[PDB]
Amino acid sequence: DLSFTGLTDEQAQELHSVYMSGLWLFSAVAVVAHLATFIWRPWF
Amino acid sequence: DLSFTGLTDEQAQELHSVYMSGLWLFSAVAVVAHLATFIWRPWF
Amino acid sequence: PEYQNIFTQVQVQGPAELGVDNENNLTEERTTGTGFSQLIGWIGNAQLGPIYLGWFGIISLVTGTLWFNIVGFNMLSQVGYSIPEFIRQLFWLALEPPSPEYGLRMPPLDDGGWFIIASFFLLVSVISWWLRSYQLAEMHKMGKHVAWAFAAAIWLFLVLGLFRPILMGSWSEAVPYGIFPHLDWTTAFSIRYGNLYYNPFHALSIVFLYGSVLLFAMHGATILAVTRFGGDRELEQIYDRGTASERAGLFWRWTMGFNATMEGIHRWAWWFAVLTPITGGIGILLTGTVVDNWFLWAVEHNFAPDYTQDYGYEAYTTYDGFLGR
Amino acid sequence: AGHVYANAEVGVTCFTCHRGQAVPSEVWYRIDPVTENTSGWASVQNRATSLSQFTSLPSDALYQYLLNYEQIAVHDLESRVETLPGDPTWQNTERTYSLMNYF
Amino acid sequence: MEETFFGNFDLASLSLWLFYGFFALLIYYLQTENMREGYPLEDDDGNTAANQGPFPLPKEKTFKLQHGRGELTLPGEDVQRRDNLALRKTAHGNGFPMEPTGDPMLDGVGPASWSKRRDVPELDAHGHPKIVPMSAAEGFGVSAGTDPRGLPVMAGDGEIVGLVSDMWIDEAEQLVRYLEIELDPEWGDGKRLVQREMVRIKSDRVKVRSIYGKHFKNVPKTKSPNQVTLLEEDKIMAYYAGGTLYADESRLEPQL
Amino acid sequence: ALLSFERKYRVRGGTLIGGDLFDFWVGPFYVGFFGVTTAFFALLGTILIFWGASQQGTFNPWLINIAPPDLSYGLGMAPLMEGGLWQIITICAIGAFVSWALREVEICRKLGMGYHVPFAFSVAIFAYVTLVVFRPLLMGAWGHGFPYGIWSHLDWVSNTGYAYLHFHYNPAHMIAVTFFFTTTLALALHGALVLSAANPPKGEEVKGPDNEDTFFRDFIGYSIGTLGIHRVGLLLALNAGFWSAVCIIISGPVWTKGWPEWWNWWLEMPIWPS
Amino acid sequence: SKFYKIWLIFDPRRVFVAQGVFLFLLAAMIHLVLLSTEHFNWFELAAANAA
Amino acid sequence: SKFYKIWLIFDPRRVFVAQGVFLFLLAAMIHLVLLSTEHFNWFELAAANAA
Amino acid sequence: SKFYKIWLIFDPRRVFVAQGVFLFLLAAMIHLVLLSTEHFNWFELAAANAA
Amino acid sequence: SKFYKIWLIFDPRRVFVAQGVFLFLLAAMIHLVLLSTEHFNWFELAAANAA
Amino acid sequence: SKFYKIWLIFDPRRVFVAQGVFLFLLAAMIHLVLLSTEHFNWFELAAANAA
Amino acid sequence: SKFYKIWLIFDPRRVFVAQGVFLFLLAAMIHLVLLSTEHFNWFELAAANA
Amino acid sequence: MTCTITCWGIGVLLGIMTTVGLMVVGWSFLQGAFMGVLAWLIVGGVLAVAVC
Ligand code: BCL
Ligand code: BCL
Ligand code: BCL
Ligand code: BCL
Ligand SMILES: CC[C@H]1c2cc3[nH]c4c(c3C)C(=O)[C@H](C(=O)OC)c4c3nc(cc4[nH]c(cc(n2)[C@@H]1C)c(C(C)=O)c4C)[C@@H](C)[C@@H]3CCC(=O)OC/C=C(\C)CCC[C@H](C)CCC[C@H](C)CCCC(C)C
Ligand code: HEC
Ligand code: HEC
Ligand SMILES: COC(C)(C)C(=O)/C=C/C(C)=C/C=C/C(C)=C/C=C/C(C)=C/C=C/C=C(C)/C=C/C=C(/C)CC/C=C(/C)CCC=C(C)C
Ligand SMILES: COC(C)(C)C(=O)/C=C/C(C)=C/C=C/C(C)=C/C=C/C(C)=C/C=C/C=C(C)/C=C/C=C(/C)CC/C=C(/C)CCC=C(C)C
Ligand SMILES: COC(C)(C)C(=O)/C=C/C(C)=C/C=C/C(C)=C/C=C/C(C)=C/C=C/C=C(C)/C=C/C=C(\C)CC/C=C(/C)CCC=C(C)C
Ligand SMILES: COC(C)(C)C(=O)\C=C/C(C)=C/C=C/C(C)=C/C=C/C(C)=C/C=C\C=C(C)\C=C\C=C(\C)CC/C=C(/C)CCC=C(C)C
């Protein structure tokens, strides 16, 4: 029952679900940005 | 019985198990990252 | 705006404070003559209190005058006793050290002989003043930090004019007694032995010289910032910590992650100032006696930067282009 | 020709030094003693003279270096040397620096 | 000597590394001497913190206090600790500001917080209290600047909360410490002290901007009108500085 | 972690901008709006230094050298590896220094203390600002700023010093240097008095302000007091920073000849006989 | 997995500030690194491409 | 084994922050080390391969 | 998706001021970056284009 | 043996940070020493082998 | 013999910290001394043997 | 003789730490001084014998 | 005060007046400024003491 921030297990579980929604969306945009740049001028 | 941080014996075990799971995932990415780089330009 | 405690806005003057006393009987050698200056009282204490004149103080004052007079009489005689020319060239005249051809032997009076005699009285005068600081602390039953800090300054003072010339085997290595000439010596000393910038101890002394001004700006500002909590009464804040010491500590803890105590600040203050001439004395003592060229020492030890660009002005512009024609 | 034709064909003519004067300007004489009560290294400096370049540096730098072929170089050419007597001192550096403000 | 001990490690290089060892020892000595007060670290909840820093606590040093006030060893239990603080944590974790549970200036928290110093007056070399009113002080008088006695006192909101009846001086150092304010009945009841460092003295008035007119009635008082203890000194000075943030909501809220 | 007395001071408020969005502590450090910008500017500037060090070919801290562009580039932007990186790091450094000073304002506002420290730091910032932007602006090129190297920026000082043929003769340098040697003089003696009074010989009572007040009265005949030494002490160091800023901003924008030649006004005064 | 427990020890409004600076630090730093190179400096490549 | 007892000695919050700073400084340093070398500088190699 | 909860942890009025300053400074910075170049300096292009 | 009593002398939580910093500074320095030598610099060896 | 009494005079904590620091600095110095010499520099000798 | 009375004057703690620092610095100096000489430098001598 | 500052203000104004006055009759700005600085210190100091 460790909680240094006071958030319960369900409270952080639902917050972390949103965090990955932002993280994956940010990564998804980064992938398309990286994919487009590689087609433009590849670095490999 | 001995704990300078206040964590219980079972609380630390739960925290460490997730930490190792994160450690292996981070290391697994690095291994694939190193493997891709070695095929790109080997350093041995 | 809020009152920044920079100038006192009201002064109170009472009976002159003659000072504390104990069984050492300080009052015997005190002048018992006091004066109050309201001009200096705006920023500091206004009482020009009595001075304890002992035998270390008198000998230092008398011998210091002899060094001052011998230098001055020589400078006056250097310009042929022309007072208008002596005043005009005051910043340029000096008592030059002996010529290098004489080594450590006594040179002629006109060729640095009076320099050694004047230096002899200056050395006695400076050491006597240090003994006064040591004796006064012992007779005041306080620590000898004033004497110990002074000894650090004397260390560079002794190295510059007494220790290094002896080690170098020539009295010519001393510093001339002039306003501009000891600046010329300072520049010539750096040029003669390579580049004194690349002396690690000169760099180290600059670190503590910069740190001393940096700390004592920090300590002065912090105390004035907490002087609304009686922070200027540091001693009472050491024996009984008030909120002045707490906020002063917490200001620097929240700014840079660590702080000091009201007493521990002066240990930082004492040591940074004391290390300025201690490292400088070592750097000067190692100059000529050991190294003789510091930039080549830097190149040998691989910390002299290397530049790849060209050096001439023709590589960057033309003479006509610079002149705009 | 290696100096007056350094960059271009500048050259030197009679007008270069005189500039319309019977005696060229910026000529110098040996004001060596300058100081009255001193001799040696103390009698060539420590006074703002015409040749000292507004400094207390030696005023005999032009005489010693540009007329008497004295050694101008003062640095030690390696990291550490044995400072044997007769080597250039800070006084020689002071005189070299005096000539060199003139440059 | 111009010979290298090994490689390019000469006497100049040897002295440099000798100073590196000394400076490292000096830094350790200086930092530990700075830890005589405030440690152990503890956390927001008040329990001892898990982390205590790389530097260990120094050995106890003993101060022989004068005027028969006993000894003092700084590394130890701190008598200046304040209990029953009126604060609550805004977060369950660490590193977050505390929210005062009542009036921050009345409770003495934050900029208005004082320290539990000794409840005795500071004494000079002679032994009598250091800070005394000029009425009690003998031979003292104004020598320069504007005399604030009799001038009205203006608060931070422009209210006139009384006039300066007397000013307390440090006769040991011949320095003005406080100004007594004879609070008007409409604002206060008796006399309040304001430190010289938080009051700006003009030609016709003395202005203190940290404290509004309504906060003078709550300024801490002194037990006696002839001396002020270190505890009363700490409470009085902290109250005025607490007004720099707690006089009105505008001061506490961000300026932009 | 906290201190034994830190809890009662960690209160909400005192920010200049951002309110409670950033108002928290990370470890002992206070993080504000300007602590966020300090972290961004300091990290970006530090990384760009090591990025420039990587392409420079050496990571040796002594030999790292991020130099300003050539004087031909003027006040415009240069290629990032032809001096343009120095311009960005300067922008990051200026942003980090100003944020650091503004962060100190929030810290001392939350503690209800005076703003002397951020003001005193602003003088140090001004001394840096007059060295990196003000003087290059007056001289018309960013190449007049000092490079960002531990030993490379000493060569700039040495060359700029000898750019006026004897830099000791700079009148403002004399005033500024006199303040450094005296600020360390005041620091040594002031630190000694408090230490001597608080640490008397073993077995003897500690001393109060009177004993140190009468010590330099017995020593040098005058004592400026406990409060006065900090007041003159801040002024001595601030004047050291200010006059150092002056001596370099007049060297080249205001005075182009040798600094010894400046003293020619005193030598050839009409009163002096020929 | 159970990485959601990272919010049991790290408070959301103190880490999001930490990553906000870090993410923009990376975004600004990497772009400047590309601008330093002569091959990935898209600003000068437009000039080179247009001649 | 019993390596989990490191958290009875070390606070999880301060260690995680410690490695987060350390691991990124690792990643930044190593990436910069390769960028210093002429062989592993992928930015210059793109220019060479483009020809 | 469910990003509306970001205002449950960050003060809306504090964030808006912070992001307003960030957006303008970023906009001013990028505009000055364009002005530093030759290809994308619209002020210089007009002079060059007009004879 | 009886070496376990070192923890009766040293605080475990202060030694571990001390050796954690020491071990990495050890590891970095030996890596940097190897890189300085021309024989053991694997970055230049990779460049030489590729040729 | 009877040297155990040194711990009645020296604090075990202060000496052990000093001894640990002194031993490594002494060990580092001697290793650095050998590297300076051209006969005991094992890094340069490995290159010589390989060539 | 009866030199044991020196400890009635000198604090054993302060003398022992001073002696330990003095002994190593003296020992290090003599080792360094020998390394400076051309004769007793055992590192250079071993190279010569090779 | 209200009188020492005024006397100090009078002295610095006279120093500026003596600075420009010497430039008009020849001299130089730096030579004139020194006499102006000297006039500010002497006349200002004398006034600050002679009249209070
Ligand atoms: C070299 C070839 C391309 C190039 C290749 C790439 C590639 C490849 C990528 C980028 C990516 C990015 N590039 Mg680029 N990029 C180039 C030139 C540019 C130029 C320009 C003027 O030339 C610009 C402006 C950018 C800008 C950017 C950003 C759009 C983005 C990185 C985001 C970041 O660092 O901060 C983000 C950090 C933040 C934390 C800032 C947050 C600030 C705001 C105000 C915070 C508001 C939060 C508040 C609480 C409100 C919350 C609301 C939420 C929406 C719910 N690039 C060149 C032309 N660029 C990278 C990316 O990730 O894109 C997604 C990417 O993958
Ligand atoms: C071209 C010039 C050379 C140069 C050549 C030197 C030389 C030469 C020296 C220094 C030294 C110093 N240099 Mg350097 N230095 C240069 C560039 C710099 C720069 C810079 C920004 O460029 C700086 C900041 C410095 C800074 C410093 C200080 C760190 C240091 C002096 C220590 C001290 O406090 O002295 C203060 C100490 C004293 C003044 C002497 C003690 C005085 C005695 C005790 C007092 C007696 C008083 C006397 C009796 C008169 C009393 C009269 C009263 C009225 C009664 N240097 C360049 C490289 N530098 C010194 C050093 O090396 O230290 C290791 C030194 O000798
Ligand atoms: C040939 C050399 C010439 C010479 C040429 C110069 C030149 C050229 C200069 C000086 C300047 C100075 N010289 Mg000089 N000078 C010479 C001889 C000397 C001697 C001596 C004993 O011989 C001395 C004492 C001095 C003394 C000084 C001071 C007047 C001044 C030093 C800089 C300054 O004040 O700080 C001011 C600088 C700052 C306050 C730095 C600001 C720091 C910032 C705000 C914070 C830094 C944070 C940073 C990121 C670190 C953080 C990292 C970690 C997290 C902590 N000079 C010789 C003759 N001198 C320098 C000057 O005045 O600069 C203004 C100057 O440019
Ligand atoms: C030379 C050939 C390849 C190369 C080969 C490799 C190899 C091989 C590796 C990398 C690695 C990495 N490379 Mg690389 N790399 C190259 C060029 C690049 C470039 C570029 C623009 O050119 C970039 C951006 C990167 C970037 C990266 C990162 C993806 C990664 C380093 C992570 C690290 O150091 O910090 C880590 C930072 C931290 C630990 C802190 C992160 C901070 C965040 C914001 C904290 C959030 C925590 C918060 C609580 C949320 C928690 C949520 C959890 C999910 C619960 N590389 C070249 C092209 N690179 C190294 C790596 O680590 O891979 C994994 C790796 O092994
Ligand atoms: C009154 C003038 C004196 C002074 C005062 C002063 N300095 C101060 C303060 C005060 C009152 C502070 O409160 C503040 C502080 O907190 O100090 C601990 C500070 C400070 N002055 C400092 C140092 C310092 N002071 C110096 C001098 C002086 N400062 C004067 C003597 C010098 C000199 C002479 O060079 C230095 C180096 C810092 C310890 C601190 C400022 C901390 C700071 O700015 O933090 C934010 C930035 C970073 C953590 C890193 C930023 C990195 C950059 C983005 C890139 C690099 C830029 C830089 C140009 C690098 C150049 C390197 C080469 C030159 C080697
Ligand atoms: C580089 C300078 C140099 C050049 C070239 C030069 N002179 Fe001279 N000249 C001198 C110097 C030095 C003096 C001595 C100073 C003096 O007498 O005023 C001098 C003096 C003289 C004098 C004597 C002045 C007197 O006081 O009576 C004459 C005549 C003379 N020059 C003629 C010439 C002529 C004609 C030329 C052109 C060919 C010429 N000089 C070019 C350097 C030179
Ligand atoms: C036109 C360039 C010129 C100027 C201006 C100049 N130098 Fe020189 N300098 C020289 C020449 C030529 C020499 C060579 C003399 C010799 O070695 O006989 C020299 C030699 C020196 C030496 C001797 C160094 C060594 O031991 O070889 C010093 C000292 C010196 N210069 C310092 C300075 C200083 C300080 C300045 C700044 C005022 C300066 N120089 C400016 C041309 C000049
Ligand atoms: C020097 O070297 C060179 C080669 C030059 C170099 O470049 C080296 C580069 C190097 C080393 C880069 C190393 C990169 C690394 C480490 C990558 C870190 C990046 C990471 C980890 C990505 C996080 C993404 C987080 C987001 C974007 C979350 C979105 C958050 C959203 C907004 C959700 C939150 C919203 C809510 C509503 C919460 C719910 C709230 C309640 C329920 C209340
Ligand atoms: C200079 O020399 C040159 C040659 C250049 C050089 O490069 C030298 C290089 C040198 C010396 C390498 C030095 C590197 C070393 C030593 C490697 C350390 C690296 C290590 C150790 C890896 C840790 C990984 C930890 C993670 C990444 C965990 C992930 C954490 C996850 C996220 C779990 C957290 C999740 C939770 C839910 C919370 C916990 C649970 C509860 C709260 C229940
Ligand atoms: C300069 O160049 C030249 C000249 C060439 C030069 O190099 C000169 C070299 C010179 C001069 C060398 C000077 C070296 C000297 C003098 C050697 C000192 C070195 C010594 C003495 C070695 C101590 C070793 C002690 C250990 C390793 C204990 C280990 C203890 C372990 C860890 C057990 C833990 C201990 C406990 C007690 C447990 C706790 C118990 C209870 C709590 C019950
Ligand atoms: C109006 O009154 C009259 C009277 C007319 C007058 O003119 C007044 C006097 C006037 C105006 C002279 C003004 C003096 C001036 C400007 C001098 C400035 C002085 C300066 C800058 C000092 C430089 C630093 C020198 C060092 C660093 C020394 C250190 C050397 C010490 C001393 C060590 C001892 C040396 C020895 C050699 C030992 C000898 C002993 C034996 C051999 C036993």
Residue numbers in the entry:
A (entry chain e), B (entry chain f): 6 to 49
C (entry chain M): 2 to 326
D (entry chain C): 156 to 258
E (entry chain H): 1 to 256
F (entry chain L): 2 to 275
G (entry chain E), H (entry chain F), I (entry chain D), J (entry chain G), K (entry chain I): 2 to 52
L (entry chain J): 2 to 51
M (entry chain O): 8 to 59
Give the original sentences from the paper that presented this experimental model.
By using cryogenic electron microscopy (cryo‐EM), we determined three structures of the DsRC‐LH1s purified in salt‐free, Mg2+‐containing, and EDTA‐2Na‐containing solutions with global resolutions of 2.7, 2.7, and 2.8 Å, respectively. The DsRC‐LH1 purified using Mg2+ solutions shows high homogeneity with a sharp peak after gel filtration using a Superose 6 Increase column. The vitrified DsRC‐LH1 sample was imaged, and, using the single‐particle analysis approach the structure of the DsRC‐LH1 was determined at a global resolution of 2.7 Å, as assessed by the gold standard Fourier shell correlation (FSC) at 0.143. The DsRC‐LH1 complex exhibits overall dimensions of ≈127 Å by 122 Å by 126 Å. In addition to the protein subunits, we identified 38 BChls a, two BPhes a, 35 spheroidenones, 14 lipids (12 phosphatidylglycerols and two di‐phosphatidylglycerol), three heme groups, two ubiquinone‐10 molecules, and one iron atom within the DsRC‐LH1. The purified DsRC‐LH1 complex showed high stability in Mg2+‐ or Ca2+‐containing solutions. In particular, the DsRC‐LH1 particles exhibited stable forms in Mg2+ and Ca2+ solutions, whereas most of the DsRC‐LH1 particles purified in salt‐free or EDTA‐2Na solutions were severely disrupted. When incubated at 50 °C, the DsRC‐LH1 samples in Mg2+ and Ca2+ solutions showed higher thermal stability and the relative intensity of LH1 Qy absorption at 867 nm decreased slightly within 90 min. However, in the DsRC‐LH1 the residues αn‐Asp49 and αn‐Ile51 are replaced by α‐Leu46 and α‐Ala47, resulting in the inability of Ca2+ to be stably bound at this position. This is consistent with the observation that the DsRC‐LH1 samples purified using Ca2+‐ or Mg2+‐containing solutions showed no significant changes in the absorption spectra compared to DsRC‐LH1 samples purified using salt‐free or EDTA‐2Na solutions. Since we found only two possible binding sites of bivalent ions in the DsRC‐LH1 complex, the stabilizing effects of bivalent ions on the complex may be mainly through non‐specific binding to the surface of the complex or the residues distributed in the gap between the reaction center and the LH1, which may also represent an adaptation to the marine environments where D. shibae has been found to exist.
The reaction center‐light harvesting 1 (RC‐LH1) complex converts solar energy into electrical energy, driving the initiation of photosynthesis. The authors present a cryo‐electron microscopy structure of the RC‐LH1 isolated from a marine photoheterotrophic bacterium Dinoroseobacter shibae. The RC comprises four subunits, including a three‐heme cytochrome (Cyt) c protein, and is surrounded by a closed LH ring composed of 17 pairs of antenna subunits. Notably, a novel subunit with an N‐terminal “helix‐turn‐helix” motif embedded in the gap between the RC and the LH ring is identified.
